[PDB]
Amino acid sequence: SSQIRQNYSTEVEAAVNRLVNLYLRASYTYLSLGFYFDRDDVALCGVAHFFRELAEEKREGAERLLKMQNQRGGRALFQDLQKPSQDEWGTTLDAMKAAIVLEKSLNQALLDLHALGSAQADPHLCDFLESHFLDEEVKLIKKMGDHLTNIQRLVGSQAGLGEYLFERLTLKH
Amino acid sequence: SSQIRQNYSTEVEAAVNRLVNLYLRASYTYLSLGFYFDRDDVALCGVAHFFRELAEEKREGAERLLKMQNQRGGRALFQDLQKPSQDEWGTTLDAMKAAIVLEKSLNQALLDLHALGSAQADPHLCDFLESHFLDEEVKLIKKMGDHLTNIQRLVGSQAGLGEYLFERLTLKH
Amino acid sequence: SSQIRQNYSTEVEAAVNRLVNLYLRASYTYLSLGFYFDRDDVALCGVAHFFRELAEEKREGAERLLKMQNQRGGRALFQDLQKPSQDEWGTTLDAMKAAIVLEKSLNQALLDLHALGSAQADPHLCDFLESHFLDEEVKLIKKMGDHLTNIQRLVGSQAGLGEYLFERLTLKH
Amino acid sequence: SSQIRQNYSTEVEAAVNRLVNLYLRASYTYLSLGFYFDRDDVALCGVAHFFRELAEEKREGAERLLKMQNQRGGRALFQDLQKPSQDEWGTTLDAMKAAIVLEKSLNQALLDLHALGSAQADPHLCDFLESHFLDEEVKLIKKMGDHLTNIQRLVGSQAGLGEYLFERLTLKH
Amino acid sequence: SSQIRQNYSTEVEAAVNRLVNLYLRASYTYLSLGFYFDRDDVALCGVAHFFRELAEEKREGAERLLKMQNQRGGRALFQDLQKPSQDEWGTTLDAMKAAIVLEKSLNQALLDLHALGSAQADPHLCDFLESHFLDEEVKLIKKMGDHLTNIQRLVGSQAGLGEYLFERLTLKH
Amino acid sequence: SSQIRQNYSTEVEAAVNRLVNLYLRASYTYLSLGFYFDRDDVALCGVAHFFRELAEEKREGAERLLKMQNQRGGRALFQDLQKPSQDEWGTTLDAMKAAIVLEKSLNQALLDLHALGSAQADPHLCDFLESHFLDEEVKLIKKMGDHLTNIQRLVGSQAGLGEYLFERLTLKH
């Protein structure tokens, strides 16, 4: 087929489609996190908003990947989105630990795709990742680490008070 | 458990969760439609944007349902999102026919949920659907029917020309 | 000689000069295309303007390459610019096909230069191409593919009407 | 052919095409001059900008000629553009002397074309040249003569100092 | 330890710390240059300001490297800053020659770090350098070469006059 | 030498150079403190900013001293800057204690220099210190004492919570 496709391997095309799925899955996980913290029996508004905003960011990442797939002459292929790994997400610390784990997996997927692009001598792909994804992900993971540290400092032996304060004073809504 | 839940049946709670899944599935279908019409070998910008905007609307419908689930003291439960029914969506007519089919199924789900709420004497639910979903869906289905009619009129024996004109003159981007 | 040159191979320097020539040749081709579509017996104003704007963009690409050649301490060397491959460019479809061919050749030259820079461990060059040329070229080729598709859809068995409509409704002046 | 052509000789048509080539060649020469004076080992910013601006003006002259060729129903025909006569342009004095030589040749070409138009009783052509080219060229040649005089006065036996001062105090960037 | 560190080698971490030291050392050298040209018996205000502004830029480079070191989960380690290589910096030409030497050493350190990152498959690092350091350094070295050329042209056999003029007419304060 | 120097002893000149070194060393210490509190495993943004701002203030103190050294006809002489006394700075209390110690040493150096100036009957120096340094330092040491007191009050037996609160409610970023 393609009238525009140039220097775009089938391997990169398929890996782009898989990364789309991983970003949409991450978005869905964040949607679940966001609504869990909005429960009347959890009620941590700032935490909810933090995860809700991440759901939006990850959907935007997927949409940028899809746009690029079309710009390169590849074909978007969608698969099922697996529901999130938990139905209830525990404390803010549990949730932030789960978020960092999820982000490290996305980062590793970005790094794996970058390596594939280098192997395939696909500099456009390499640039696209560098310019829209790699630093954004490093910044986000740093912010989550900063949060985890502050959450952990606040646990002590008065965990409720610390969880309230973090939400009130770090994650202002 | 719940400290707030009142007049909120387990049957409605589960049906709300199922409707969330149907809205998110519809959003995903529209995301696929949107990107298909952005392909270099399809290239109907107005069609793409129409479906992309619908993806956003259906995600917003899901988020309103999730918000209400929490307001009522129910518990959001997420399931897999099944990938869309096609990988390639054919002509604008094929796509708009598929969209109307999808919307009629969502509408029927709304009507089924409303009937459950009436059976359960849950007026809050009934009002919520009436006020945010039932008329929005009737308006959308009317707009899709209007489109289908105009698309069909334009086919004739010069289908390419008609498809271009519809996109240019009805769905301005 | 150079008091500033550092990590800048003679091979990259010469390839930069050759790419300048290819960009200026592309500019010249577009100048010819632009004036052909302004002929009284062709008279497709939007087509003319599309190619005229491309002539300007390709000259700007050449000037950025020349600026960089001086920033690196290389020496600009100019060669003849070969006149464009045709004197008359046929239909809008013929012209857009010729434009995509030309752009794919420029893209391949960019990719070849990038590969040379990688081989020579010249990251400044690699970055320069990634940042000002590779994505610009992918975007342009995608836009030309989108056009070609719409042009092709409009041919049918009423080619004049389709050519007029494309110019009027896609390439507004 | 032409449905519009009137009082437009084949001789004038061909001479217009040749003048286009001479203007584009002059533009190219100025592009080379502009980049030479931007070299780290030349570094005369004002000189560079003077020639860069002339490159633009000469391209604009060519484009006006091409527009007129189409207005008259003639057919643009492009030939190769011969690379500029030097790769390195010497001092500002050498360059300005080369520029005046180039401009006198363009002027003589304008005058020769005007004479052809008079011989062919083509007043539109005569007016076009008078109104957009002849006085512009006389003004430019006067400005170059004024520069040459000031450059020459500044040589004396401190040539570097004089070259710096001219660039700083006459050709402010 | 680190809860965020991912794909960040100990080799890159240590080299980042060494580059910080090189940037801070360069800042210190520029601070010394700046104050030397502010001496009553040197009194070249524009030269002073040029070097003072470079001191600030190099400190900012160090601070960006330190910020990135923390974003990646590395640990900043500081060492002594060696005092600048001279106490008195000679003429503006001597100083600008010393500045270009210093900058070429920084550039080579950037290029060496980039090569390490490529060897370690660390694209974030590679991108960080490309995006904030490599082109900034090429631009700065080009500007210093342009200055050196103008300074050299002005020496002749009236060195005082040329030094005054360069400061007055190129480096306006 | 000096054409301007008047009433400026070699003893004061050398002591000014030593104080410059002490201010630059203090700046460097604060740079290290600032980045330590920006670590993902420390993550006290307000603390970081407090020390980062002090790094800037101490560099400015050094630059004022250097400016004055030139105004008086003295000669700036730079020495090595010894790296900061620690690589890791402990808690906010540890850091603020270290900061007060550092500031008391700077203050004592100011007082020692003032005494030298009085001994040398150098009223300009005395005024310069009084007007730009002595009260600034007293104000800063008072602010650090106020902080130390609040930090100490917050330790109690819930040290993490107190450290978070101080950063959030006293050192707002």
Ligand SMILES: [Ru+3]
């Ligand atoms: Ru809220």
Ligand SMILES: [Ru+3]
């Ligand atoms: Ru890469």
Ligand SMILES: [Ru+3]
């Ligand atoms: Ru982009």
Ligand SMILES: [Ru+3]
């Ligand atoms: Ru809120």
Ligand SMILES: [Ru+3]
């Ligand atoms: Ru569009």
Ligand SMILES: [Ru+3]
């Ligand atoms: Ru009802």
Ligand SMILES: [Ru+3]
């Ligand atoms: Ru409502």
Ligand SMILES: [Ru+3]
């Ligand atoms: Ru559009």
Ligand SMILES: [Ru+3]
């Ligand atoms: Ru027009």
Ligand SMILES: [Ru+3]
């Ligand atoms: Ru590369």
Ligand SMILES: [Ru+3]
């Ligand atoms: Ru750039």
Ligand SMILES: [Ru+3]
């Ligand atoms: Ru027009």
Ligand SMILES: [Ru+3]
């Ligand atoms: Ru310039």
Ligand SMILES: [Ru+3]
């Ligand atoms: Ru005449």
Ligand SMILES: [Ru+3]
């Ligand atoms: Ru006119």
Ligand SMILES: [Ru+3]
């Ligand atoms: Ru300039």
